[PDB]
């Protein structure tokens with residue numbers, strides 16, 4: 135069995151190996167990469183996502199989100215307070231202000247210490263989930279707006295044609311902006327490219343140990359757990375590495391820098407934070423190996439998780455027994 139300790143693997147494809155996206159994912163899996171829940175892909179030196187980032191300031195962040203925390207430093211939830219619209223140039227100036235900028239630090243480890251000590255005492259503003267793409271249309275390799283669609287994968291594997299679309303999303307971050315513990319919708323893969331700016335630190339639980347994280351989360355968030363049998367689908371709960379280590383939960387960590395891709399694998403729980411002003415692009419995708427995870431994915435039916443149009447068909451076809459209850463949660 136490849137990668138039996140479930141370590142995060144880092145890949146360096148050549149320009150020839152970067153042509154065929156599906157084939158390279160399957161290669162990484164042949165080496166055991168999925169056992170970690172997360173992999174890093176460093177693009178060949180010849181590749182670029184686009185020519186420059188000099189002309190992105192007029193993109194609109196229609197609904198910036200202020201991430202307000204409650205709890206203790208290592209165990210907290212966050213809620214998202216909507217703010218007035220602002221452009222990317224306006225948000226970058228805000229991120230760089232004295233109130234929001236990254237503090238002085240020695241290295242990534244010192245910054246990580248400061249994040250976990252101090253996050254809860256601040257409310258950073260995140261531009262998340264903005265439909266769109268920064269890949270040049272002429273970039274042919276690993277262009278997250280040109281991937282094979284999940285609907286087409288389900289149709290190729292299972293024979294059933296379904297409605298729905300699959301497009302990418304932009305994320306504009308600042309120091310302390312936070313992504314809560316989650317797996318993807320329908321336990322899909324994700325791919326995330328850090329276009330520019332400061333790093334993103336990730337934490338991940340191997341898929342084979344995901345239920346250990348869920349059982350800890352029910353203990354640490356007991357009211358939330360009574361409210362919903364899949365409350366991590368709400369994407370609001372944070373647990374620090376120190377608390378995970380105290381409770382014996384297997385995990386790994388890695389920092390993504392600008393120019394790098396990360397892939398999350400089906401049922402790989404992940405969480406993390408941004409080091410300073412940055413922009414990432416991410417999308418969900420599927421492979422044949424996903425289908426069995428989609429059929430077994432938990433679902434939130436309490437009403438909180440509210441998701442895209444396209445998840446309807448995935449529930450309806452892969453989980454027909456759950457469909458009626460889940461759709462009630464959507465309405």
Ligand SMILES: O=C(O)CNC(=O)C(=O)O
Nearest residue numbers: 305313324325326414416
């Ligand atoms: O970058 C972020 O805020 C969150 N991204 C992801 O969870 C992802 O790419 O799967």
Ligand SMILES: [Mg+2]
Nearest residue numbers: 190191192193
């Ligand atoms: Mg612009």
Ligand code: NI
Nearest residue numbers: 317318324398
């Ligand atoms: Ni994710």
Ligand SMILES: [Zn+2]
Nearest residue numbers: 362434436438
């Ligand atoms: Zn719920």
